[PDB]
Symmetry: D3
Subunit: 185 residues, 6 copies
Amino acid sequence: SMACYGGFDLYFILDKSGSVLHHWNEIYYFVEQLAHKFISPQLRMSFIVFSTRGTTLMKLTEDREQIRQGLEELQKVLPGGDTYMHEGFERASEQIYYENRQGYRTASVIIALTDGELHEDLFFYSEREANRSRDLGAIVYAVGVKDFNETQLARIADSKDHVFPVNDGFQALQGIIHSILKKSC
Amino acid sequence: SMACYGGFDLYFILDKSGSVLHHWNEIYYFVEQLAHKFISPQLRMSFIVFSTRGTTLMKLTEDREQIRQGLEELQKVLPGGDTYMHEGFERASEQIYYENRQGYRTASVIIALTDGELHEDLFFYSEREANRSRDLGAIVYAVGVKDFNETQLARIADSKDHVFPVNDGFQALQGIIHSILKKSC
Amino acid sequence: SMACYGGFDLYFILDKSGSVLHHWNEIYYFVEQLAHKFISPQLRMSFIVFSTRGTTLMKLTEDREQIRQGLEELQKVLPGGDTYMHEGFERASEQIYYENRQGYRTASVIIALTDGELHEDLFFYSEREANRSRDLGAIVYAVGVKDFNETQLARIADSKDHVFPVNDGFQALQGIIHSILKKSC
Amino acid sequence: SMACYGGFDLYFILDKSGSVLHHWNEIYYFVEQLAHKFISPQLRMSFIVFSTRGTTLMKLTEDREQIRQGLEELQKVLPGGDTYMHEGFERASEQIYYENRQGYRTASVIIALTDGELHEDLFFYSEREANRSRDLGAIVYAVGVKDFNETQLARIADSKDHVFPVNDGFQALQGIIHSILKKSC
Amino acid sequence: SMACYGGFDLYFILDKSGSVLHHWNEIYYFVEQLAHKFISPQLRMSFIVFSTRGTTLMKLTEDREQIRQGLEELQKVLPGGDTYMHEGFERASEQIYYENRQGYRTASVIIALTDGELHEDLFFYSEREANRSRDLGAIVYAVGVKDFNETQLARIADSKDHVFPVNDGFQALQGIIHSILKKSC
Amino acid sequence: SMACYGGFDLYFILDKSGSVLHHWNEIYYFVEQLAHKFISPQLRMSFIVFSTRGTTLMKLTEDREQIRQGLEELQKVLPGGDTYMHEGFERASEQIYYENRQGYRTASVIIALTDGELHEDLFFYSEREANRSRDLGAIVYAVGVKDFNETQLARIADSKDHVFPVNDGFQALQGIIHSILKKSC
Ligand SMILES: [Mg+2]
Ligand SMILES: [Mg+2]
Ligand SMILES: [Mg+2]
Ligand SMILES: [Mg+2]
Ligand SMILES: [Mg+2]
Ligand SMILES: [Mg+2]
C-alpha cells in the first residue's frame, strides 16, 4: 500500500565461508558503502555473518557508533568454514519476529551476499528459511559474487528481479534504500 | 504477513439515505451488537454516516465512553436524503491517511452498510473512493440490506467474499474481528 | 477495469444429450426466465445446443423477434445423443472471435447448462475449449443439472464461484446480468 | 495444469486433544466414511493424530488392509492432552518430502480436522508448518468441529474456500476427492 | 486477452518544470521522433504538459496536421515552475474517461517523461492519480531523464519493467507501439 | 513448489523458414552449444523444426547417440517456406500430453528460436498453441534472431522475462538449465 513506513530495518546476511575468501573485501565494501551513504537514524541495520554457523555480529540498531564498531568488526572477518546460509536467515527471522511484536509498519529488508555455492541440502534449508523470513514480513534480496547462478539465488530472493551481481546490486539497492527512506513516516 | 497488528481500526460507513428508512434499525443493531461484543481498547472504531453528504459522526477511538456516546447518537439517526456513499469513504480515507503517518502496522477495516441503491455516477465515485481507501491500506467489507445486488457491492468491497447480507453479516464479521484481535501484538 | 462495456454478449451453451432427457424443461425455463426478464437490446444473446455435435441454434442477436423464435425452437428440443460439450464452446468461441474483430469492449459471458456427465476425453476437450473461450475474452459460468460434481464443473467455469446449481441459478445469474447491464456505456 | 496426477496422497491430520473429548466420534466418522467411500489403490492415505505431540498412526499407504487396521486404531483413540497441531503438520511434511524425492506428479492433499482452539503461540507454529506443507506441494483443507472460527482455520487451510464444517464437509470433500481421482493418470 | 484493439490512444505526459531545464530538448525529441515514426491514423495521441499546473496542449487525435501543429507548440515550450505531475495524469484520466464512454476496446497507454524529482506530497498525489489512470484502463510507462530513481518511478508506472531511461525507452516503446499497432482490429 | 523434478524435458522449436535463410547456423549453434554443455541423461530433449509445416526431427530422448544423430540432421537443415510456428508448438504439445500420462513431475521447457516475423493469423495461431502448451504444463521461452520484436515474442513466451536475444540467450538459458538439473530428484 501507499502507507508510509514507521520503521526501516535492514538485515545484511553475509557469506564468510571459505569459498568467498577472495571476495570478502568486495562484500565488506558493499556493506560499508551503503552504511556510509545512509547515516540517518530512520534506517536501522543488523550485520549477520554465516559460514559453518550463522551469528548476529551486530543486532539491529540505529546507533552509528555501534554501526561503526560493527563495520570495524566486519573488516577483520577471516573467511573460512562451510556455507550454512539458512542459519543466517534464522538470525534475521529471530530479530524480525521480535520487532514484529512492537507493532510498527516496517520495511524489513534482507540483503544476502553470497557466491551461491551451496550444497544441495544447504540450498533446501536456505530456501525454507528465506520463505520463513517472507512469512514474517521480510523482502529478500540476494546479491551474488563470483560465479553465482541467478536462477538459484532467485529461489532465495523474492524473485529474479531481487537478484543482482555485486556491482550492479550496489547501485540498484542504493536507489531502493533511498526510495524506502523517502517513504518513511 | 504473519506479523501481528499493532493497531486494529474499524471504520463503519453507514447508509442513512431515504431508501434505508425501513432498514435503519437493522443497520444500527448490526453496529451496536459488534461494539458491545468487542469492548477491548485494542479495537478502535469510527462511525461515519452518509446520505446527501458524508460525515464522521464519531472519529476513530478506543475510548468506550466516546463509543457509548457515538452509539447513542447513531440510534437517533433519521434516514433521509440522497446516497453519496463516496463521501463516506472520503471520511474514512482522511482518517486512515492521518493514522498511517503514525507508522503502526494496522488492520484498517471498513464495513460499509447499504442497500446498494446508488445512481450510476454515484456508484462510479464510490468505486473510485473505495479503491483509494484500499490504496491507503484498507480492507473493505460491504454488508447489504434490502434487495441489494451482490455483484454491484463486490465492486465496492474487496471481493465477492467481502460482501455479506445483513442477517448473516454479524456472525461472519464477529468471527473476522475476533481473529484480527487474536492477531494483535 | 472501471471502463463501461460497449457491448454485452450472452452465450447459452445448452446440454441436450441423452442423459438430460427429462431435465430439458428445467434447462429451457432457466433460459426463458432470463431472456424474458432482460428484454433490453443492450443485451445480445446466442443459443447453442450440444449433444453428439454442437450447433448454433440462434446466432448472437439483439433482435427480440429472433430471440422469440429461438426460444420457440428451444422449447421443442428433443434430447438425445452423446455429450460433446467442447463443440458447444467451439460454437461460442467462433462467434466471440468474430465479434472481437469489431473492436468493442464487450462483456462476453458464457452460461453452460449441463449435468457434467462427460467421459474422460470429452471432459479434457471441454476444458481445453473453455480455456480457449477465456483467451478470447469470455467469462464462463456453469449451471449444474441433476447430481452434478461442483469441482468438475469448476474446471469448465472460471472458478468454483462461477458454478451454480440449476435451482439457485436464476437468482444468482439475474443479479450478475443486472450488474453488467448497469455497467453498460 | 491440465496434466493428470501420477499419484494421489491424502493426509488426515486428526485433533485428539482434550478439547475434542465429546467430538472424536465426528472426527473419526468423517475419516471412516471417506476411506471406505474411496477404496481404489489409486488413492493413498495417511492417518496422523495430534494432541500433546504429533504422531503418524498410519504411514501413507494404498494398502486397504493397512487402512482397515489404521481405522480400527482410530476407533480406540482417547482424547486428551494439549493441541500441538504444528506437530501434526510436521508428520505430514516429513512424508511429503520423502514422496517428493520419488519424482511423481502427485495431488498431495492435507485434511486437518480440529476445533481450532489453539493457544496463540501454538497457532503461530501451526500456520508456519501449514505454510511449509504448501511449500512442499500440499493443498491444505481444514474441517472444523464444534463452533470453530472459520477465519482462524483459513490461516491454516489454503483459503476460506478450503474450510468446511464437519457435519457437511464429507459431502464437499467426497466431491473434491472424486474429481482428483478422475484427474488421475 | 487475445482480442484485438479497436483503438490505440497514446497519452504523452511531459515534465516542463524548472528541474528539466537542461533536458526539455531530450524530452521533445523523444516525442517528435515517436510521432514521426508512427503516422498511421490507427494511432491517436495527446500531448499533455505539466509544471505548476497540468494542461492538455493537444487533445487526443488521429489527425496528423493537428499533431504537426502540436509538435510545433511543444518545440517552443520553456521549462519552469513546480512539478505537479498528478495534474498531468488528471488531464489524461479525464480524456480516458470520455473515451471509455464510447465503448471501444482500446489500448490506452501513458508515457510520462520526467526526472521524478517530486516533493513528498506531490509524489503521493502523483501515485494516487496514476492508480486512477490504471483503474480507467490505462497502462502507464515512465521514461526518466537525469539520474532518476527507478524504484520511485516504478510507483508511477505499472511496474519497474515499465520504467526506462531515454535511449533504451525510445527503442523499447517503438517496439511496444509497433506491437500494439499489429494488434489493431 | 520446492518439490524436485522427476523429469526434465526440453523441447527446441526451431524456425527454418525462408526469412531465416542466412541465419540457420546461428540457430543450430545455439542448440548445439546447449546440447554439448548438458550431457546428463537427466536431461531429455526433442528437436522440432518448422516452416511451412511443423515436424518432430527428433522425439524426446535422453539418449546421447540419438541426440548426436539429431544434431547431425539439424546441421544439414536447409531453410525455406512459410512460418507456421503454431505447428511447431503442436509437435511439442503432442509429446507433452503423452509424457503427462506417465504421471511424473517434470520440468517441461520449450525454447522457441525464431525471428518472430509471423503474419497476423499465424501469430494468432501461435499464441493459441503456446497457451495450449502452458495448459499442459510447459514453460515457454523465446530466443529471437534478426531484428525481432520482444513485445511480440512475449505473447508466445510466458512473459517478457522469458524472451531473450540470440546473443544473450545462451548465458541465460544455460543458467536456467543448470538450476533445473540441480533441482532434479
Ligand atoms: Mg561457501
Ligand atoms: Mg439510498
Ligand atoms: Mg450427457
Ligand atoms: Mg484442543
Ligand atoms: Mg521538476
Ligand atoms: Mg519466417
